[PDB]
Design a protein around this ligand. Structure first.
Ligand code: B52
Ligand code: B52
Lengths: 263, 263
């Protein structure tokens, strides 16, 4: 089904053999620090190593602009040195993205899908890295949620391609939890397979999100079973990646899903 | 979609509003006992109460023939008195089934789908209780797994209907883990929605099963995440019931699944 691999500088991710697990990295800043402190970088590296050991395939690291660079750059440097897995930088700023790849990051993760700072697509085209274009918007007025999300995502693909991003470095995301009501999130979940017609790999980010809380009536740290349900549903509907906190568990559910669906 | 309710003497189960959770009851026999001892019946009732509290909708209780009655009858009596949920008796013997309904059981659960002791269908027709007809057989020679399972299940429906069982008291089960190789179990999982053409509610029993172990390479008590995956996949493919050990967790995944699929 995918006739290519995700090329990430030194690592390659096969899109066909398994669902890929992107581990969300814990970034508790040191009060008194600008970024760089031993306690924060060390907790970061230990956390990344643990996620590596539990089955993560990518480490996702996130961090005003000059400040964000100071915080996140030391962490990319430490983690990429010490953990042999691709890193995605979770930013929507072209400057931070530039810096982060410079510092060692392999993939851009833009929660604004190149709409906040279109220049980030150029950053991306230039370093030749995968970019994740998440569905987002500044309002919730949908004529038809799914059709609009697809229009919107498609507007991001336009910006990316126009700045020179190759199709093989585009990954899309429904942006669950963004610019959507709780019932809209469930509906996007129900209809996720429609994103496939666009022809790109899809990443799902639902981990611990509020709509799970809304359904189960359970606080943030009681949402492991409902995150699991969203991951399973997402894999059944053809997503290639899941972005999760609870790597050990989700990574087991993914692998069981993969065996059943024949991935 | 279902234009009836499951009628279970004093309780009614709606097939449309949620996936129904059948709790597997722990039956550690008292050495020195025939059946009836305080320790075993009490651990049984406490376990049933706990499962009731975690979201179970049915308690499934299972227990040579005169011995099986002695063991299981005291437990049905205690649990039905003390826990206000339907009970299914897990047996394939017409005599045990008779006794168990007499003792208080509401539903028959036959892992042989009325083929071991066809008389059980008559027991069922007579007391007017739901009967679960599980796919099983004494060999694994499949021309075409799915088509054969459906033939086989259909042979059980014949035996049930011929003994006077009304359509509304038939529930079917793929019998995952029975008479199937590990790859056959995954294939039945992959194709579960085909059982729907038969027109009956479907119950899935995959909890902690060996094929999950085979996939994840994890022992019996490390299979919660992979059980979860099978439950989610089963709900997505239209099952009405799941038979599970880990009621608290599975019951949360079910409920999240239900909200996403719009049940
Ligand atoms: C808001 C935050 C969270 O984990 O709650 C979040 N952050 N980021 C960076 C994300 N990135 C991508 N691609 N998808 C996402 O769903 C997503 C998120 O949901
Ligand atoms: C073998 C045992 C187990 O839990 O491992 C089992 N017992 N019973 C009574 C079952 N009944 C129905 N209906 N379905 C089942 O899948 C099933 C089972 O898998």
């Amino acid at each position: 089904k995918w006739d290519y691999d995700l090329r990430c500088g030194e690592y390659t991710l096969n899109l066909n053999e398994k669902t890929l697990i992107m581990g969300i990295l814990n970034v508790t800043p040191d009060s008194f620090s600008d970024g760089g402190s031993y306690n924060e970088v060390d907790a970061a590296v230990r956390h990344a190593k643990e996620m590596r050991d539990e089955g993560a395939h990518i480490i996702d690291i996130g961090g005003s602009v000059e400040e964000e660079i100071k915080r996140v750059v030391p962490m990319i440097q430490a983690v990429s040195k010490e953990v042999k897995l691709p890193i995605s930088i979770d930013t929507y700023k072209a400057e931070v993205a530039k810096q982060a790849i410079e510092a060692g990051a392999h993939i851009i993760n833009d929660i604004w899908g190149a709409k906040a700072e279109p220049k980030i697509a150029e950053v991306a085209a230039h370093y030749d890295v995968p970019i994740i274009l998440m569905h987002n918007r500044d309002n919730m007025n949908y004529r038809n949620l799914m059709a609009d999300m697809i229009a919107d995502l498609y507007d991001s693909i336009k910006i990316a391609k126009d700045a020179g991003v190759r199709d093989e470095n585009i990954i899309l995301d429904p942006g669950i939890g963004f610019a959507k009501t709780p019932e809209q999130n469930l509906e996007a979940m129900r209809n996720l397979e429609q994103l496939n017609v666009l022809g790109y790999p899809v990443l799902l980010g639902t981990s611990r999100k509020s709509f799970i809380g809304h359904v189960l009536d359970l606080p943030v740290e009681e949402r492991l079973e409902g995150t699991g349900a969203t991951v399973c549903l997402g894999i059944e509907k053809g997503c290639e990646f899941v972005r999760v906190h609870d790597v050990k568990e989700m990574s087991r559910m993914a692998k069981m899903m993969d065996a059943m669906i024949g991935k």
